[PDB]
Amino acid sequence: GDWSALGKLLDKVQAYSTAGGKVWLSVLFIFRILLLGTAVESAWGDEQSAFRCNTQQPGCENVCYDKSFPISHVRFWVLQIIFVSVPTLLYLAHVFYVMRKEEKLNKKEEELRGGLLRTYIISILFKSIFEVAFLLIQWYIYGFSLSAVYTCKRDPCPHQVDCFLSRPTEKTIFIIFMLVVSLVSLALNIIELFYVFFKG
Amino acid sequence: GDWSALGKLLDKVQAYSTAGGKVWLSVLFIFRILLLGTAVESAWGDEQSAFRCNTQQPGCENVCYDKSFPISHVRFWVLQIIFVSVPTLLYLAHVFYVMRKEEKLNKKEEELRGGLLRTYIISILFKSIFEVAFLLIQWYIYGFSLSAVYTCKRDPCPHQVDCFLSRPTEKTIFIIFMLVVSLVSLALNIIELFYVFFKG
Amino acid sequence: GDWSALGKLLDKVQAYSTAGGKVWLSVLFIFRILLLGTAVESAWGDEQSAFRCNTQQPGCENVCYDKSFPISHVRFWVLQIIFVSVPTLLYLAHVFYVMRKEEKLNKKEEELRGGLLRTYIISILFKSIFEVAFLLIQWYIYGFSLSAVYTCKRDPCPHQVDCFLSRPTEKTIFIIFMLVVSLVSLALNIIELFYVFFKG
Amino acid sequence: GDWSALGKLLDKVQAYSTAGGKVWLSVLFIFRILLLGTAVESAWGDEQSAFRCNTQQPGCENVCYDKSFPISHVRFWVLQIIFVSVPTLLYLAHVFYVMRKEEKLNKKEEELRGGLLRTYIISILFKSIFEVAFLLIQWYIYGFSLSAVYTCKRDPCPHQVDCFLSRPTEKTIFIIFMLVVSLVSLALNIIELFYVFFKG
Amino acid sequence: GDWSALGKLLDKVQAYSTAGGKVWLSVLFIFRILLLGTAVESAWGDEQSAFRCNTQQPGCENVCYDKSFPISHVRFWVLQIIFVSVPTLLYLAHVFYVMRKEEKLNKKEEELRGGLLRTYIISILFKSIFEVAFLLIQWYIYGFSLSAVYTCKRDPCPHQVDCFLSRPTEKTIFIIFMLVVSLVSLALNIIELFYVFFKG
Amino acid sequence: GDWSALGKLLDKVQAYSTAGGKVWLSVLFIFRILLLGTAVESAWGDEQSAFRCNTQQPGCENVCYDKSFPISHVRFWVLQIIFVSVPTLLYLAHVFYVMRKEEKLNKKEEELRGGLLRTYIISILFKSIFEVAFLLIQWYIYGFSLSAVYTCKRDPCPHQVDCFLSRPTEKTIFIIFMLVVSLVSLALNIIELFYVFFKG
């Protein structure tokens, strides 16, 4: 039975916000890592092996596929998850080490509202900023639909060449799904901030 | 020995319905995740690599396969499992945190039928609604049989083109099996609701 | 040390039959899941990628392979294992919850031969019925040998076409092995039933 | 700390033979499962995909490869390991359940050289019989060398056809290695039997 | 509960530097092993299978790809992680064994600033030296950009041959990312060294 | 808390040699199994699928690749690790069982420098002999460099045939690295032997 020194750590860190701010923030565990690990990875399996362009010329397929996709979507969502997860991790590390230093303190000098809310709201605004920045980068690069026919105009390919993607509809549905989950996570992060700021 | 603080949590949450409502609801653990993970995933392995259409034209295979399958069945059942699992998870989280708050309560202020049934029946009706919605979407999109010959009439393919699927009979049997398991889960969810409503 | 509340559960459930009924029923753990997971799965690896028919016509290979194999053997044995495992699991769940209810009972009202054999023999006869039904379905569908040459007579293939399977001898040996293990499991299940019925 | 109820079980079962009979019988754990799992499995990876015969005729490759290899060596060694491991497992199960019944006994009726050596020598002679039977079957089927050129004379291939195997030298070395390990295990099993029989 | 004999070991080793030197040195766990294991490995999947040069001559592709890539980037970053991780590991091993010897000491002879900072700064300067050496080797070998067209002038290829790489943009982005993480790790390692040297 | 009966076993076995003999012998755990499992395995992935010889004749590629590589390097290093690891394992097993027999002894008969150094130096000299034997076998078979062009003169290939290997430079670097690690392990094993022999 060694689940006590960790039970108090979570009750101290979860005492700030509303309980709805924690019991609705499980979508980072059930809707993000699970969906990226299980289903949507296999849809991007045969990416380059099924891309085909209508040309006799050798080597045009590689440069046209490069111009179509600067960076595939699954690595993009992995970078989004990594760059969003980090402030919560450093916040938990700082809070746990401050708690451990004070737990060492009262047994080393007492044998005879603070900066935590500031760090908390800093982490929340950083999460919001990174989420809206990644959403704007995706809206600028790709849009939220994929056409089955792409027109390629790159060297050393002759004038205009047509290329056909692999499985566009399923990728469209999954792009829309990740967009909806990201927007819901954004609104959920701003709602608890409004709740805490109107509590004080 | 640390299996006591979790033994009471399950006896409190399982005290509402009949024991048959729990000991028959193991099919989410034995018939859904096991069957999707072990057997039926390997049947959808060589999906695009064995699809073939009878045409000399380049790139017609991709668009005809896209028009045949907007979304493959295994990702559809994964989305069904995820969208059905979530209400039970949030119900357990809310009940455990209410129990933890009241366990903190009686040691913080006593040293000197409720909303749970409402949340329970809300979760059960949400499970039923999502199950019948997914079944109706599958009945509208695909039907419950697969033909070996498909007729494709999409650009830029010439007039009419024939395509042959890969392994239709085994996929037909597994579609029928998942349909039967979904219907049995639906009837099982409504039976305990009738039992609880006629208990009170 | 938390292996006491589980040690009594197994001694209560194993008290009914002979000890030989349990120490010989480990073949579901050593001969079924191990053999299907380790060796015989890799033999059915290159199933469709090595099937070949002797025709110039496109798309005849898929329909002839479909007519040869309605459902491959490894998914069939997986369905057999799943449909045989379930009565033991529900029997253990019912017995454990009855034991837990009575363990709660004698501490809630005593502070101041039964239905189990019926459920047991019901589970045993269900196991026997499912085993002999799966064996008869396999004897009706495939037989217990495989020829290297198959004659295919399906549309849109011309008149008669010959196809050659991949690795028939190893699959024949493994089919014979699973048949022998299934028959031994059947006789082993009926022997303990005779022993218990002649005990009483 | 729950490693006491298992420490006595091993001291009781290891009290019969010499300590060298146990500390040298770790080759079933370090030399058999490790070597089959790690190194020698990858050598039989591209078995059928690199087999090639010198003929224009379609479908001759499959039947000539079938006639060359009735059953590949890795599944053969897996069957050898499984059919050798089982007597030790049933011996441990019987000894542990007899020990548990007698541990229940002296607390249920005493509150106010035997059959084990027979079962032990039966298990040892069964291990020896199965080892020498598998070695004789391998000596009858394959021999202990592989030629790079095979002559195939099977229907419907024309008269005589030549086929070339993939990587024969590495497979020869591993066949010789498994033969040496099997012979050493045989001599090691018979030495402890002689030691125990000359002890009594 | 066995997390005490390890809790003191970490408080002794983390007592030297600032807490920011440890809570910011988690990037070896969250940004290095995770990113190399999950995302960037799959980008270097189809390396040789998509490399193509524009020549009729057999075997020119292998030597031109060899001259383009002496060693691929993922094995290079793996060697960097391994050669950077080792001084911290030997430092922890030496400190733990010195602590264990002194813990044995005061119970064996007392029943009736030191070399650690030197070893610490030695490990830190070794980490800095290896990081800047690997960065200079990568700047000398490859540069920090990749062109889609490579000119190959090696035997036995005729005069000048052109080759096209696979997915250059995504690899460029990941090269820039690993460069930024390495520079940040370098500055972070030198900052705590300045902090400790100006503390004393 | 069950890490005491194992803490004394390691302090008894590590009491013989210097602490540097143990804290520097972690390279079997950090530099051998990790490097073989993670990086260098993927370099030998596409071995046979990229080997190509310049001939129109069928089946010459297999015999020329066989004559080039009698046994690939990764299985060779796996055999080296297995044949080096075993003396330490049997030494630990013998020491632990002697310690367990004497721990049973003083509680069974006392209720009212030795052979260990000989076994230790035997294990060390066996490790040295096996290391230098494997290094001499590798120096005799392959040398420590690989040429991109191989000349093959085997039946039934016509007179002289040229073959081109896949990725020779990276394999050269990894061969040199494993050679350096093996030589460092050899010198490290002989240094502690000199230290112990000059201690006594």
Looking at residue C162, what DSSP letter applies? Answer: E
Whole-angstrom Cα distance, residue D66 to residue B45? Answer: 26
Point out which residues pair with D52 in neighbouring strands.
Answer: D164
Using CB atoms within 10 A of its CB, is residue C2 exposed (0-12), middle (13-18) or buried (19+)? Answer: exposed
Q: What is the dihedral of CA B26, B30, B33, B37, to 10 degrees?
A: 180
Whole-angstrom Cα distance, residue D72 to residue D146? Answer: 13
Q: Which residue has the tokens 């699954």?
A: A74
Q: For F53, how many CA atoms within 13 A lie in the half-sphere containing its CB?
A: 26
Q: What is the dihedral of CA B40, B42, B43, B48, to 10 degrees?
A: 130
Residue type at position E106: N
Q: With contact defined as beta carbons under 8 Å apart, do C186 and C128 qualify?
A: yes
Whole-angstrom Cα distance, residue C170 to residue F180? Answer: 45
- Three-state secondary structure string covering B44-66: CCCCCCCCEECCCCCCHHHHHHH
Q: How far is CA A197 from CA A118, C13, C46, D161, F179, in A?
A: 12, 58, 62, 85, 64
Among the partner-chain residues A62, A74, A79, the one whose CB lies closest to the CB of E164 is: A62
Q: With contact defined as beta carbons under 8 Å apart, do A173 and A199 qualify?
A: no
CB atoms within 10 A of CB B152: 20
Q: How far is F168 from chain E (nearest CA, A)?
A: 7
All residues at 6 or more sequence positions from C130 whose CB lies less than 8 Å from its CB, including other chains: C80, C83, C84
What is the resolution in angstroms? 3.8
Q: With contact defined as beta carbons under 8 Å apart, do B192 and B16 qualify?
A: no
Q: How far is B122 from chain C (nearest CA, A)?
A: 26
Whole-angstrom Cα distance, residue E104 to residue E98? Answer: 10
The residue of chain C nearest to residue D83, with distances taken between CA atoms, is C31
CB–CB contact B26 C82 (8 Å): no
Residue C149's SS3 state is: strand
Rg (CA), chain B: 24
Q: F110 CB near a chain D CB, below 8 Å?
A: no
For chain F, the straight-line distance linking the first and the last C-alpha, in angstroms and rounded, comes to: 38
For residue A38, the chain B residues in CB contact (below 8 A) are 78
Whole-angstrom Cα distance, residue F149 to residue A85? Answer: 50
Q: How far is C24 from chain B (nearest CA, A)?
A: 24
The residue of chain A nearest to residue B57, with distances taken between CA atoms, is A54
Closest CA to E185 of E32, E49, E3, E78: E32
Alpha carbon F88 to its chain centroid, in Å, reads 13
Residue type at position F115: G
Give the DSSP per-residue string, E16-45: SS-THHHHTTTHIIIIIHHHHHHTHHHHTS
Q: How far is C113 from chain D (nearest CA, A)?
A: 21
Method underlying the structure: cryo-EM
Whole-angstrom Cα distance, residue E23 to residue E26? Answer: 6
Residue E194's SS3 state is: helix
Looking at residue B31, what DSSP letter applies? Answer: I
Q: With contact defined as beta carbons under 8 Å apart, do F116 and F95 qualify?
A: yes
CATH number of the domain at A6-199, out of 3.40.50.2300, 1.10.3720.10, 1.20.1440.80, 3.90.79.10? Answer: 1.20.1440.80
Closest CA to B76 of B187, B182, B183: B182
Point out which residues pair with A42 in neighbouring strands.
Answer: none
Q: B170 CB near a chain C CB, below 8 Å?
A: yes
Using CB atoms within 10 A of its CB, is residue E121 exposed (0-12), middle (13-18) or buried (19+)? Answer: middle
The residue of chain A nearest to residue B77, with distances taken between CA atoms, is A39
CB–CB contact B167 C66 (8 Å): yes
CB–CB contact E165 A62 (8 Å): yes
Q: Where are the domains of chain E?
A: 6-199
Using CB atoms within 10 A of its CB, is residue F40 exposed (0-12), middle (13-18) or buried (19+)? Answer: buried
Whole-angstrom Cα distance, residue A123 to residue A102? Answer: 22
All residues at 6 or more sequence positions from D50 whose CB lies less than 8 Å from its CB, including other chains: D166, D167, F48, F62
Q: Which residue has the tokens 């909303």?
A: B115
Among the partner-chain residues D63, D70, D89, the one whose CB lies closest to the CB of C170 is: D70
Whole-angstrom Cα distance, residue D179 to residue D135? Answer: 8
Closest CA to C78 of B43, A111, B142, A150: B43
- Dihedral sign, CA of A141, A146, A147, A150? positive
**B contact residues 136-165, partner C, Cβ 8 Å cutoff:** 148, 162, 164-165
Q: How far is C3 from chain B (nearest CA, A)?
A: 9
Q: Which residue has the tokens 């509590």?
A: A199
Q: B75 CB near a chain A CB, below 8 Å?
A: yes
Token readout for A76 is 């993009």
> In degrees, to the nearest 5, what angle opens at C-alpha C33 toward C-alphas C31 and C35?
55
For residue C172, the chain D residues in CB contact (below 8 A) are none
Q: What is the dihedral of CA D139, D141, D143, D148, to 10 degrees?
A: -170
Q: Which residue has the tokens 């097993």?
A: F93
